[PDB]
Amino acid sequence: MVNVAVIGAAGGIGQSLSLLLLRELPFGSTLSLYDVVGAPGVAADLSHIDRAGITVKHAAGKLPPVPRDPALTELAEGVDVFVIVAGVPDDLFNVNAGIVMDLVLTCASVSPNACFCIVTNPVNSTTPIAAQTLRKIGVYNKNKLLGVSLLDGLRATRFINNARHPLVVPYVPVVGGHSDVTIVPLYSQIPGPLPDESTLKEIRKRVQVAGTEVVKAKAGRGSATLSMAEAGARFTMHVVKALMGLDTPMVYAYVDTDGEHECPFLAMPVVLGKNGIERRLPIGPITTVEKEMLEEAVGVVKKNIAKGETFARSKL
Amino acid sequence: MVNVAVIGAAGGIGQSLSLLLLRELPFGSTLSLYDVVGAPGVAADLSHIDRAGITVKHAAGKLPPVPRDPALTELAEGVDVFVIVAGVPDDLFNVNAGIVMDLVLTCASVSPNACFCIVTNPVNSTTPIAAQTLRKIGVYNKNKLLGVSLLDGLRATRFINNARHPLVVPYVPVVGGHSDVTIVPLYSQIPGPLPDESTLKEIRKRVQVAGTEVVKAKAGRGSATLSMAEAGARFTMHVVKALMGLDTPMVYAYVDTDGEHECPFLAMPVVLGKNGIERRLPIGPITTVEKEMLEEAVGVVKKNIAKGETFARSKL
Amino acid sequence: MVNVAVIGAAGGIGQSLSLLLLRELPFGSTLSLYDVVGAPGVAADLSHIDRAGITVKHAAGKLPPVPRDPALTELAEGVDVFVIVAGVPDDLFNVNAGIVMDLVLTCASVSPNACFCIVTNPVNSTTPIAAQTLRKIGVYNKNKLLGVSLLDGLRATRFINNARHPLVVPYVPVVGGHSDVTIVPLYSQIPGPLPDESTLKEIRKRVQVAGTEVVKAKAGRGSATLSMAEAGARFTMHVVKALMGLDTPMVYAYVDTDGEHECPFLAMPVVLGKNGIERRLPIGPITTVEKEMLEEAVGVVKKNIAKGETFARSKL
Amino acid sequence: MVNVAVIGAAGGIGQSLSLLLLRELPFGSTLSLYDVVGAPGVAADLSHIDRAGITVKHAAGKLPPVPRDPALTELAEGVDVFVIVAGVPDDLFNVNAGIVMDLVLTCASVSPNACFCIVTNPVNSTTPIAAQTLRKIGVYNKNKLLGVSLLDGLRATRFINNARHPLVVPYVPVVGGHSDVTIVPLYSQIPGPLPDESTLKEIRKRVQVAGTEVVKAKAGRGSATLSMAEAGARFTMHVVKALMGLDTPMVYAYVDTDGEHECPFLAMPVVLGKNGIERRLPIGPITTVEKEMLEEAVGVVKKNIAKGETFARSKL
Amino acid sequence: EWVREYAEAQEQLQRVQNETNYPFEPNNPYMYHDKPMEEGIAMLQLANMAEAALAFEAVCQKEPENVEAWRRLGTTQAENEKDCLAIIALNHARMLDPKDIAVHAALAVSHTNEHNVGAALQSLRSWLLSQPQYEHFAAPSEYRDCCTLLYAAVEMNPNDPQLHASLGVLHNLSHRFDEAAKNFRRAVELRPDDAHMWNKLGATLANGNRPQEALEAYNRALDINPGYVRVMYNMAVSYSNMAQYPLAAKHITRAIALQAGGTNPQGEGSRIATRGLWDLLRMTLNLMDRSDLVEASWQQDLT
Amino acid sequence: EKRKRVSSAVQFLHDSRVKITPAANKIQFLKSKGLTTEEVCEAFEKAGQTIPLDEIKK
Known part of the structure; x- marks a missing residue:
């Protein structure tokens, strides 16, 4: 049970x-x-x-x-x-x-x-x-x-599938963080030919900014509620099935790097089962543009972690 | 499509x-x-x-x-x-x-x-x-x-399964109307042995009164909205599959009796198809206690139909 | 595992x-x-x-x-x-x-x-x-x-769903034994209106004789082999899921009656659980023709049981 | 339908x-x-x-x-x-x-x-x-x-999965032909870390000699029939679903290259739709070892095409 | 009344076609001579194979119920490349009387070229059981039930080659190509001077993937007599899978052109038989990047 | 002389008892009477049933 x-x-x-x-x-x-x-x-x-x-x-x-x-x-x-x-x-x-x-x-x-x-x-x-x-x-x-941090993957998959039709992929890798400039989608790692760099630039920018257009659609009165619920339910089901012994899925999550990376916390691929995380995997090959994006992403994520720990330290 | x-x-x-x-x-x-x-x-x-x-x-x-x-x-x-x-x-x-x-x-x-x-x-x-x-x-x-009117059947199935556990049934037939005294579940038509008549009366009263149970817990601030969403979605999927030619399911709905009953509108079993309703079925054998409740339910729903049709005509 | x-x-x-x-x-x-x-x-x-x-x-x-x-x-x-x-x-x-x-x-x-x-x-x-x-x-x-004994139920369901259309039922109760004159389908216990008795007893006869139909089609060179594989796989999956704690299904099988019937072995409904059979259910109401069929089936089932036990006692 | x-x-x-x-x-x-x-x-x-x-x-x-x-x-x-x-x-x-x-x-x-x-x-x-x-x-x-040609894809996926366990991929691309030397698995195109070359080429060799393995186990009295049936049914369901408009999948099959490759017939990725093949996809990047393997395979594939298209029987 | 004799000649065509739907070809020039058989038997030797068939065909108008006419017609029409149009003649030759061993052998061969195994074995068996000295898994019966009576017919009368020909045909239809060749080899040892078995030796080597052997046998066959377009077709088939397409096409065309050498070349109805040979022209000539030529391949008039 | 042959050929060709049959049969018949290609033309022409000379010859 x-x-x-x-x-x-x-x-x-x-x-x-x-x-x-x-x-x-x-x-x-x-x-x-x-x-x-x-x-x-x-x-x-x-x-x-x-x-x-x-x-x-x-x-x-x-x-x-x-x-x-x-x-x-x-x-x-x-x-x-x-x-x-x-x-x-x-x-x-x-x-x-x-x-x-x-x-x-x-x-x-x-x-x-x-x-x-x-x-x-x-x-x-x-x-x-x-x-x-x-x-x-x-x-x-x-x-x-x-x-x-599974909502960014959902958005990235949706936008790339809308671009390349009929050519469907089930998922897209996303690394870095979970806020604005810290989101880095790696389109070079999906199967099939890709559109021009000029359009991939716009798709990536759309992925990083998608959270604000829903707020603007609601006239500042609210935010997204349904897509976050769906992402949370899917991730929870992954964890439950892995913990019961009925699977060993591979997922992207914001976890502790444990010396695998220079940043204490980062979004990265893992395989979990029966005890939580089982293996944490390398990011893999990337192009020059993606390297440039990831440099800035990591630079900001370090500051976010520092502020979080600064707040935490002050409470006994 | x-x-x-x-x-x-x-x-x-x-x-x-x-x-x-x-x-x-x-x-x-x-x-x-x-x-x-x-x-x-x-x-x-x-x-x-x-x-x-x-x-x-x-x-x-x-x-x-x-x-x-x-x-x-x-x-x-x-x-x-x-x-x-x-x-x-x-x-x-x-x-x-x-x-x-x-x-x-x-x-x-x-x-x-x-x-x-x-x-x-x-x-x-x-x-x-x-x-x-x-x-x-x-x-x-x-x-x-x-x-x-599927929410009545969901409630009846839930309440019966809790009493006979581990014996489980997938559905319960409910006829009559959709409000208070006009709801009649037919427990004599499901397989397996049943509890005593003194317990069945309480279970039957729960199904009729369950709508006010949720309002009380919410302290008058609202009503049930997840159960109704569930029922509506499940019914709409039946309709869609029947229209597309991928099924012919048997359902209970508040439909027009095409001269098959003395009451113009009633909740009764039907079979769905590519053109809508394909066949209307009879209610079947019932017990004396269920017959005496059906009489009252029909009496009330006739007044409800008359009220509904009273100003649908001669206004706007 | x-x-x-x-x-x-x-x-x-x-x-x-x-x-x-x-x-x-x-x-x-x-x-x-x-x-x-x-x-x-x-x-x-x-x-x-x-x-x-x-x-x-x-x-x-x-x-x-x-x-x-x-x-x-x-x-x-x-x-x-x-x-x-x-x-x-x-x-x-x-x-x-x-x-x-x-x-x-x-x-x-x-x-x-x-x-x-x-x-x-x-x-x-x-x-x-x-x-x-x-x-x-x-x-x-x-x-x-x-x-x-699932194959008799498969055939009984198939034939009646062929007779009535579009009106599908998921299963049919079958009791008695697993050979020719010992098979008794209970069509009175399923929902919906039935055809007239003259064709209904033809369907009952076909259910009992369906085994010899396939052998004739193969010109004596074999028997039914895919249908038995289907029935065996379905039953084994029921047992597995009930044993793992992921279900509690109701099935018909040739089991030991532990004192609730005069015949020591019979085909009857049961509930499966984590330790095998959890509950034994009664046959339930039946018409007079079905009662006459069951009374004749039991007499020959008992002779089959006696034959088997005599062989075993001689051999051991 | x-x-x-x-x-x-x-x-x-x-x-x-x-x-x-x-x-x-x-x-x-x-x-x-x-x-x-x-x-x-x-x-x-x-x-x-x-x-x-x-x-x-x-x-x-x-x-x-x-x-x-x-x-x-x-x-x-x-x-x-x-x-x-x-x-x-x-x-x-x-x-x-x-x-x-x-x-x-x-x-x-x-x-x-x-x-x-x-x-x-x-x-x-x-x-x-x-x-x-x-x-x-x-x-x-x-x-x-x-x-x-799905069977060698199933074999390739099965053989790679139980070497990296726990790390599961749903499929592996295979191109070239469909017998022994003519089939080339592209393990460089699947996510995750990969074994060393000495192990990886042993895995690659086993895939293309797997047909002899089964016949040797059966003592030469037969071949593999269950795996072929599984592969054939899985491939047929894709075509059926794509024709009806309920999907648009990407598959690997032995098809006419329509002038997009110098070999008249080859195994390649394609997208299926409502009236057959809708899009033919390129093979994509490969390493030098895989390029040499493909160079070797295409020469035999052409010799097989010639044998096929020149077939004629001699009048005694 | 000048028309009187033309009328009856026209009636004789359809009056016999009804009982045997052999498509007797209109536009036949022998149909008004007095002794077509005597010149047809000579045309078969000195001149083209394809225009003796019309003489033997014209005999059947003047004379039904003559067994020699259908025997010769059905045999020569299959020495040309018209097998499907020969089967129905040998059947009538049998219907006249079943005892002729010279007809059953032609049925035994002509059915293997169309994979009619049942008819092939039926006729191959009756061939032997017609002579008065042979008295009383492909298929667990119906096959070895025949081969075992052939193995009962070789401890005696050891060396008549028309029996080894029957063994060759039996092994050909069951894809035993690597031992049919020696049967035909022994037959050819015992009588060397007829093309009709050199062709069948070459045809077995071609199927056994020895096309470099077959060409010598075909050049024996096409030296004992010319005009034997069967072996020309087989030579084309052998060159095709030796990958010499530029030469295969020019063997094909001298097969197709020789098959129809008569003045007022053709009538109607028989052309469906030739339409099986053009497909080997198309199949080779649709290698080697030949555009704008497969369209004529679809109709007529060569190259 | 030949004129007898030509006239007989014409009266042969102009008859319904014979028209419906293929021309290729009638040429082969008529050849046997001493009517050559040239004269077969003479006959088809005078009956109004022209055919080209070479198509008769070929």
């Missing part, structure tokens, strides 16, 4: 993520839900679906947030995977960093052997904060902390 | 329904989205998913609603299925009646050969109104108008 | 069964093959297919069979399910009864906690022989011996 | 191929079977399966072989795809060539627009023969004649 817990299940991302995760989880598994407001309502109506072999649990926190909430302490016993999607919709960084710290501290104090998947933004700065918190507790494991 | 249009795609149910429908539709289909507010952002969000072979279209209406909207007139050309899921979140009927009438009148004047699936809540009263609206134009086809 | 061994893999039925089983087995499972002649060739053939996560093993016996083959005592270690499908193409009974009991005696002395699925042709008489053999060594478990 | 015909369905490969095709074909399609001996028995056996929406048809050939058999002239009406798999169980070429000429002549005269898939060995020589036969009657279409 696997027990999967969604933290922040009543939000805009969380509702769709829970709905998608309920439909795909294997027979005999459990789903745990938590939030500070609205958890009972979402847990009531997901429990009316006729899917057999699945158990649904829930907990609710005190509406004015309380650090180390006992309700979350009781729900976190026996969990295998944690999905942290509790972000509030540098004030954003200040607000979200403390939430991530508190939630990881509460969850890792009762089930230290679980896997942590971090969806709340900005990933580049929040993954090092979770690492610092876990090291403070004394239960850090480099092979079980993951940052989810 | 098929073209499926979701009307009211930016609501609470519409967004989840569109998300599920994008992942399920066959290769080479089209998905159209319309709403008075928020459609462009929903369309932009969904267009970044890496699903190949599907095209996404959108149109936006006037912020203050305008009858016979010119944009909806242009989006309605070439559509094969209309999913009517617009509705304000007996004013709850008197407000939605005008919305349904206007939407159906606008859509049917452009493509009268499409199927119409009504998901707006007062199903027992809104399905007749659409029928009279289509009749006023001269394009009514009794085999191509369906009301969606 | 689950290990399933096919005994008699180089025969006409065994080869298609092994091919179908390789395609559907879960990730991370083993497939073991054994035969007196031709095992290494089939093992080499199947090893070249690109299925990932599957291991293939094989063993070969002496060209002139010998009791207690030392290769089968080696291949049999660590097996979870045995598929006994060996058997030469009343002398047929006299030879197959001697083959089956020796094969069972060799396998059960090494791994007594496995499941035994009997596919040898005269099931009604060979399933009791295995029970006596297991009793002699002293490791009989009545919840872990099954005789395969 | 589609109508698919298997020519030579009662052979060792043919009936396993038919069994696999029966359970994979889409709802609402026809399966046709032909052979000079044994077709009625195979057709009777397969029609007892409970597959809904599929109709099985057959024709029996003349017991003493006769050219332009009237039975095959009537079964060939309305067919969309022809799978030619008949063959003997330069002595082999001298007979398979004569079989293929007559089969294609009879089939192509009544349904000229069908697609032809050649499975009879040797494809290097029997594909040009079919091209010449179609040219003689004036109905040749270069976009609808395909030679099946």
